[PDB]
Design a protein around this ligand. Structure first.
Ligand SMILES: [Ca+2]
Ligand SMILES: [Ca+2]
Ligand SMILES: [Ca+2]
Ligand SMILES: [Ca+2]
Ligand SMILES: [Ca+2]
Ligand SMILES: [Ca+2]
Ligand SMILES: [Ca+2]
Ligand SMILES: [Ca+2]
Ligand SMILES: [Ca+2]
Lengths: 448, 450, 451
């Protein structure tokens, strides 16, 4: 019907079910609209700002907002949340200290009039707090862009009060003599956002992000997709547990990721920029509460998959893309081939598996490895016999010798090791199979 | 009807009785609505701000306020009021002598306080060295309730400015005082902050909405209730009607109902659980001031049940709830590292399921290395003696040896014993009690005090 | 009727007589409303701000103002006036040189002052040395009535800036005068603040407001009344009418009713219980100024009741009340550690229940542990002698020995024996009064007399 309660130019029955914006008006969603590119949106029929961002449901869905905002935030659930963090490009150092900084942005919305805050800490003790004065105020910061932009020298940082920074008493300098870098972390960032007024001009002076930070961060779940070379932070709204009046739609984790990161789902797989980010080909990291929630919710779920559980308010997810991944079907970035591998199989995770008769050993050079970094190998093993014992030997700073008991179906195993020293002993990784085993989706991922 | 005397979008007939918000329209409360998850809201029918907070009754009940405000303040009787404090995480002194400190603001209220500007006092022993207000660099943009600034995982910020010259204290006297062994303390006085109100356009504005306007109003028409689970401290303000004024129509509720409303704790029939932990009458120790203690003493003798959680709440009461660290009830919880002596679980006269049957004396050997020194602890429990012919004395070892007697009554009685524990390399703590005959015990606990 | 001349939502026919507020609408007063707890107010029907405070009569009567405003000020005849002072708690001087001051503001009025900002002189001996206005570090966001800043439980704030800068005893005279029995006392010339009014959007705004506008109006239509119990101090202002104006329709009330309205004291027939401590005329020693004393002396001869709590309150009167430190009416209170000698309670013609049937003289010794050194005390009581044949003389031993004589009247008469005590370890005070025959004495009072 045409009854409207929240007063956001979208009918209630259209909000509860699917709806799309056609020629600046909302129409009932029809499945035949998928081919043309029309996207189906659903949102609560009792609130205008569903995700908490300043733009309402009609403004976000109809594209009537600032053009710098990515298409990911045009979904009423994804919040236009700019994430800004100061990076320390170089250090210059009684003694006067200078630093080179360059702000980074990863959210779905730009931040105007950037004004960050920094902490000068070396070990626990913080020397001083710096609010960037009028010299370092970055006027514009588009998503996935830096201030200054690529191809420009980072701007200096000497303004503390026009007093300059200085470590005094020589005790901090004495501690630094042994070697302790001065960390630069961003406590907070102050910025504005764009709203078109009655006269049509974009006004970005009276606005402020700080009013909506405590609201966006309280009615949404953070989902981060890290590919190593770049990071993307998105927040997806979700309903409360014991609230009988919260009409925020419920979405699965996979659907939340697809909505947030604008992933092209081709049949069954999920792709971000041509790289698969589906459940079986990426290592996910959750905090303790999310891990407990998922563990509790898997038993009640028949399919028993991570990407089929509903999202909940307060969730935290990190999607760590593997550094090196192979599947024996369409991708193998490993510089060195594996040992005793047979592709003549049909019982794999998607198409084929690895038929091993004996043991598999892999040798990796140190050219493509980062010293003082932790790497984790993972894969899926299938053994219908359930009678073969498999052990793995890992050569590293600390020698590891562990055994595994594969099940009838595919099971994911995680083995953690740390490599220290670029010019160290060659890493030896060997796994032994009692009989014939099936392997698929072997991945190498760099961690903290 | 539709008579709206105070004009808060809720009819007075539904304000006097129970009302609930459904589709942003107030509806009459029904007993069947409880199963679907709805809650019954009651508020006065002569004013818009029943609890004195900047948001009205309809805004609080219908959730038309900032989403960072806890559901604990969605009740019209529970005010939205942030309690911001400052914690001196570290001290740095440099060579007259320049003093620097690391602070980290803490919020334990219900509503966020944007743009926090704390004012702090630098006191060493009685004499106050200086009074400092937060500068342009020590201001936190967002302080969500039950959070800090900087958030968890970041170093504390510095406070090395007096106005923008550094701190300039005295030269010799303060150093001589410090070298004696005293410690610089920090005592916050007042904090400045704002709150959001969705204007006509739809943009939340938090510039002129100072929290300081609604502090003297909130603290005057509310009964302060404070919780302390040891780690996570909670403080709340609950509205209470005036005593001798008939024109004040604020609803009156019991202390237990006030606690359940303020802290949103689940109640499974009769027992009350906060997060699965018991904070009911016998499961926690209540602390009052003089006025509340006298009022409760006068009111209790008029109550047949003799229950603290059934005393009508009044304006200005101060109630502190301190959850004991060590709690054993012989039913589902026993956190004491050392097993007790002469304890029997075969009973049916307990407060909830069973009690403790003692034949002789009860002795416990509690390790002290697991107990922090330089603190004060209170031993509490309930004793029941139908015979009323047993003399009980307690043997407690501490810094000063103490021994007290007890005369149990027919029913269960709560007894409190006070002692001081100091010194890490000190004598082990021993607690022993002797019973003349067979006695019934329940809910034995050890609680930390000031 | 509905004749609302003053445009304050209360009819004139209701304002001239009594009116009570029920269900946010003013209704006429009937005596049956007393037992339910309602109160009757009277106000001038040509003015909205009858008392001079920024809140109108309807708002104050209905309680539609800031909730921190005291219940004592909901009466339209009592003005909401935050009397904010600054107290000296600790003084530090150490190197011209430097001297540090710790202060703690006090509020005693019926209204809270927001964003307080005092302006204090630091005098040495008559001569002024400096004038320090509070900076951004010395501003109290909230100062609720009967509550200080910093609130009780926290140490007082410092005072180390006249402009920023450091506060200095500039010349050597202030360096040498410290130890010669002198003072660095602090007195507040003025204080600043705001008040909270709700705008059309329901929000309380305290920015554009200021108490400085409503001071010369509140002080010029009122009658200052101060109460001093020796620990807590209250100051109130009660509206009154100008004598030479035929259009000031402000209702006229007596001093006793003014006290009852201002301090919310309860009157259960004959007892005026402020907070359980009686503040009746006989049970306290009043202290007036010159003008009020002359006014009462002139008016009393035209009144047959012969009481101070009956004289009509007039604009500009100043009244100070000092609750007696040591009082005993032989009925329900006696704070004297030692019982008085030669006491006979077998009587019924006392002021309230019984009197004292003295036969001879009376003597008692007051312990020195409860006397303020270097202070002037006052001993007073009522004396009745129907016989009118016994002369009363007293012998007092103190720092200076004094003898006083009294001439009793037919009915009760109040005597005063003003004396001075100095020194903690001084000579014991000898209290001795001699009566030739049988005399009646009542209400022995001991009130410290202000300088
Ligand atoms: Ca709608
Ligand atoms: Ca909507
Ligand atoms: Ca494969
Ligand atoms: Ca109403
Ligand atoms: Ca109401
Ligand atoms: Ca039990
Ligand atoms: Ca009138
Ligand atoms: Ca009037
Ligand atoms: Ca008497």
């Amino acid at each position: 019907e045409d009854l409207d309660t929240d007063n956001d130019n979208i009918p209630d029955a259209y909000e509860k079910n699917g709806y799309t914006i056609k020629d600046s008006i909302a129409v009932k969603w029809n499945d035949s609209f998928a081919e043309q590119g029309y996207k189906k949106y659903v949102s609560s029929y009792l609130e205008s700002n569903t995700a908490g961002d300043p733009y309402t449901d009609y403004q976000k869905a109809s594209g009537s907002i600032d053009k710098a905002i990515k298409l990911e935030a045009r979904d009423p659930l994804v919040a236009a949340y700019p994430v800004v963090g100061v990076g320390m490009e170089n250090l210059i150092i009684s003694a006067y200290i200078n630093a080179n900084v360059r702000y980074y942005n990863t959210g779905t919305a730009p931040m105007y009039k950037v004004t960050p805050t920094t902490n000068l800490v070396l070990d626990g003790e913080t020397l001083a707090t710096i609010k960037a004065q009028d010299n370092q105020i970055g006027n514009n910061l588009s998503p996935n862009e830096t201030y200054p932009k690529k191809g420009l020298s980072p701007l200096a940082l000497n303004t503390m009060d026009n007093a300059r920074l200085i470590p005094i008493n020589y005790d901090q300098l004495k501690k630094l003599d042994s070697g302790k870098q001065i960390k630069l972390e961003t406590t907070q960032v102050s910025g504005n956002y764009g709203t078109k007024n009655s006269q049509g001009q974009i006004i970005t002076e009276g606005n402020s992000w700080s009013n909506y930070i405590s609201q966006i961060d309280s009615v949404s779940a953070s989902i981060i997709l890290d590919t190593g070379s770049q990071t993307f932070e998105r927040r997806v709204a979700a309903k409360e547990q014991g609230n009988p009046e919260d009409k925020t739609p419920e979405i699965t984790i996979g659907e939340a990721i697809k909505k947030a990161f604008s992933a092209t789902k081709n049949g069954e797989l999920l792709y971000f920029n041509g790289i698969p980010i589906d459940e079986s080909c990426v290592e996910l990291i959750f905090d303790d509460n999310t891990s407990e929630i998922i563990k509790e919710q898997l038993k009640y779920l028949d399919d028993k998959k991570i990407y089929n559980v509903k999202l909940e308010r307060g969730m935290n997810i990190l999607i760590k893309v593997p550094s090196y991944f192979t599947n024996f079907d369409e991708y193998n970035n490993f510089p060195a081939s594996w040992s005793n591998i047979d592709t003549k199989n049909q019982d794999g995770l998607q198409s084929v598996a690895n038929k091993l008769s004996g043991e598999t050993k892999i040798i990796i050079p140190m050219s493509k490895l980062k010293p003082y970094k932790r790497y984790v190998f993972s894969g899926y093993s299938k053994d219908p016999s359930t009678s073969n014992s498999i052990t793995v030997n890992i050569k590293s700073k600390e020698q590891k010798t562990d055994y595994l008991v594969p099940e009838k179906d595919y099971t994911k195993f995680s083995y953690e090791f740390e490599t220290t020293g670029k010019d160290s002993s060659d890493i030896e990784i060997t796994l032994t199979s009692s009989g014939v085993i099936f392997l698929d989706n072997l991945s190498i991922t760099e961690l903290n």
